[PDB]
């Protein structure tokens, strides 16, 4: 904060809306974007639409572990890596597996543009997620769900 | 017509079988088939796997009615025409929308062979439904469900 006061400078974004329920959801989105850009800057961008994830899943098609159970454990994460793309499509009322099949038929930054309903190069269409966020999504989900599946017993209060 | 009936004799069939159950059971299926056949003859075969229906749905992609409600009414039947294929696939434990997407990507008699789990030409693979049956399925379902959706009030006995 002090470095900006001295350096460079300090900027304020003022959000406009007609009402107050609008003000709140809008201010919340600008706050969200403000963070996501700060993350991209410290950690770049990758193809959005969750294609980045689908792309790393095919790169790791040949990853193996110390034994067969570890292998299924890998295939479990890879298969999960498809889910963001799969939900995005499902929220559009469209066939999620059919979109996924055809994105997985492509290469590099080829993806589905859910807004316009046609395939293309995601970076060219301006659909970029920041790397830090995609990474962070993955690391954290993995961390919790990893633990979660090792649960054999649960202890809680009575109803 | 009187000559044809008379000169002419009557052909008979004796359904052979191991068990009296199967026997009389098989006998049944026979009389059935015979039916459809006579009918099939009077008015043939079409690609099974419910592809015929999926095929007519794309031919009618440009059908319209007297007003917008009539239009939705058309899209409602077309969308339904996909259901047999969709159930067949769902009974195999496989992704029904993914199969449908790829059959709809094809043409003519290209379909899914649920038995062998691979796509191909349905007539070549011997998967044929008789026309009279496919037609008749459609006409009757339409007839009842058509009426059914116009229901605003129901009158029955007390529980």
Swiss-Prot record, chains A, B:
> Localized where?
Cytoplasm
Q: What post-translational changes are documented for it? A: Phosphorylated reversibly during heat shock. Can be UMPylated on a tyrosine residue by SelO/YdiU, probably under stress conditions.
Bilayer-crossing residues are none
Q: What are the cysteine partners in each disulfide bond? A: none
Q: Where does ATP bind?
A: 49, 113-115, 129
Q: Where does the record place the modification N6-succinyllysine?
A: 24
Annotated coiled-coil segments of the chain: none
The subunit structure is: Forms a cylinder of 14 subunits composed of two heptameric rings stacked back-to-back. Interacts with the co-chaperonin GroES. Can form asymmetrical complexes, composed of one GroEL and one GroES, and symmetrical complexes, formed between one GroEL and two GroES oligomers. The asymmetrical complex is the functional unit. It was suggested that the symmetric heterooligomer may represent a transient intermediate in the chaperonin protein folding cycle.
Q: Any idea what job this protein has?
A: Together with its co-chaperonin GroES, plays an essential role in assisting protein folding. The GroEL-GroES system forms a nano-cage that allows encapsulation of the non-native substrate proteins and provides a physical environment optimized to promote and accelerate protein folding, probably by preventing aggregation and by entropically destabilizing folding intermediates.
The similarity comment for this entry is: Belongs to the chaperonin (HSP60) family.
What does the record's free text say on domains? Each subunit is composed of an apical domain that binds non-folded proteins and GroES, an intermediate domain and an equatorial domain that binds ATP and is involved in inter-ring interactions. Forms a large central channel that appears to traverse the entire length of the cylinder with no obstruction. The central channel of GroEL functions as two cavities, one in each ring, that are separated from each other by the crystallographically disordered 23-amino-acid C-terminal segments of the seven subunits. The entry and exit of polypeptide seem to be restricted to the apical end of each ring.
Q: What is this protein called?
A: Chaperonin GroEL
- The species this protein was found in: Escherichia coli (strain K12)
Q: Which residues of the full protein are shown?
A: 367 to 525 of 548
